[PDB]
Design a protein around this ligand. Structure first.
Ligand SMILES: Cc1noc(C)c1CN(C)Cc1cc2n(n1)CCN(c1cc(N)ncn1)C2
Length: 330
């Protein structure tokens, strides 16, 4: 089997991407944030505290003839930005882009933090990291991809995120028309539960490539590119007036700037992030200070190849017995 679904930016800045997911019988379609940095499929639901729901579409398990309470199971998650959610668990039928899993754990939120409530465009998360990170207790549950894997034509999924435009998540096949050149594959460590890999270096604009190992994670659920402070300083030094602002929480730059590209290495191959992908717009409405898309990972404890990086590539998440990642230009 295979599946293919379009993923759409939630706003004009690509602050996140949403993909429609069918849950239950009859189907209830929710728009979920596909997140290769976490491993829980959780949704706003009829159980979510009413004051914490503001415009999201909810899953109502009592209206699904295939939903079953997973007795005694609870979940609770915190994300890198300080947001959180928690609740109980059902199993139900879940379909993405025509690919169906029966008995998928659907984690129903009883509580969500303010950043979820305040974002009416995201109805939940669909985790695509390794199932070892799943938070369900006392019986850890499998991700949608792990449940689907054996049925897929090939044990892979691909992320093809758009810049200020829709893109595609495919399951079970590699669309050879969706990229240019060849796909370069690189080793993955699953020891922290992530799609963790080592980039071979970077370049800023037309500058020379610096060969240096940068360990980090391929994370579709993180908006920006978080890299070591040395690398990030080298990038923003090429932008007149750019500075790190403690009050704003990272590097900002004059909105009048034209930004240089940023290149990262995948083995001997190179992925070029165009400068415009690094512009996240005014820090507040009407400001001429703009927020940068490349930020320091210092204090986060891991480097994160988030959407800013991944949207410049066609990315293969190869879930073979020894997982690997593939990157192609597009
Ligand atoms: C509105 C709005 N505008 O810009 C943003 C961002 C939002 C909030 N909106 C995106 C809501 C939200 C907050 C989170 N998500 N979705 C996804 C899960 N979270 C992660 C995952 C992960 N792998 N890494 C980090 N966090 C935190």
């Amino acid at each position: 089997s295979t599946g293919s679904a379009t993923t759409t930016p939630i706003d004009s800045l690509d602050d996140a991407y949403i993909t429609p997911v069918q849950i239950g019988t009859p189907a209830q379609t929710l728009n979920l944030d596909f997140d290769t940095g976490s491993s829980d499929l959780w949704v706003f639901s009829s159980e979510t505290t009413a004051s914490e729901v503001d415009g999201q579409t909810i899953y109502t398990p009592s209206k699904s003839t295939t939903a079953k309470l997973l007795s005694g199971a609870t979940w609770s998650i915190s994300y890198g930005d300080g947001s959180s959610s928690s609740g109980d668990v059902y199993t139900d039928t879940v379909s993405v882009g025509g690919l169906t899993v029966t008995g998928q754990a659907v984690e129903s939120a009883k509580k969500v933090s303010s950043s979820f409530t305040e974002d009416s465009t995201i109805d939940g998360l669909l985790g695509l990291a390794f199932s070892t990170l799943n938070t369900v207790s006392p019986t850890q549950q499998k991700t949608f991809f792990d449940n689907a894997k054996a049925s897929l034509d090939s044990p892979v999924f691909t992320a093809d995120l758009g810049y200020h435009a829709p893109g595609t998540y495919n399951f079970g096949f590699i669309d050879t028309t969706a990229y240019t050149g060849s796909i370069t594959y690189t080793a993955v460590s699953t020891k922290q539960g992530f799609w963790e890999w080592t980039s071979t270096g970077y370049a800023v604009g037309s500058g020379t490539f610096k060969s240096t190992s940068i360990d980090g994670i391929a994370d579709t659920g993180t908006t920006l590119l978080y890299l070591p402070a040395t690398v990030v300083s080298a990038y923003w030094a090429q932008v007149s007036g750019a500075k790190s602002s403690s009050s704003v929480g990272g590097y900002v730059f004059p909105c009048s700037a034209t930004l240089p590209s940023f290149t990262f290495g995948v083995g001997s191959a190179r992925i070029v992030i165009p400068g415009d992908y690094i512009d996240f717009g005014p820090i507040s409405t009407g400001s001429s200070s703009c927020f940068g898309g490349i930020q320091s990972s210092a204090g986060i404890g891991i480097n994160i190849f988030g959407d800013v990086a991944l949207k410049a590539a066609f990315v293969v998440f190869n879930g073979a017995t020894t997982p690997t990642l593939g990157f192609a230009s597009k």
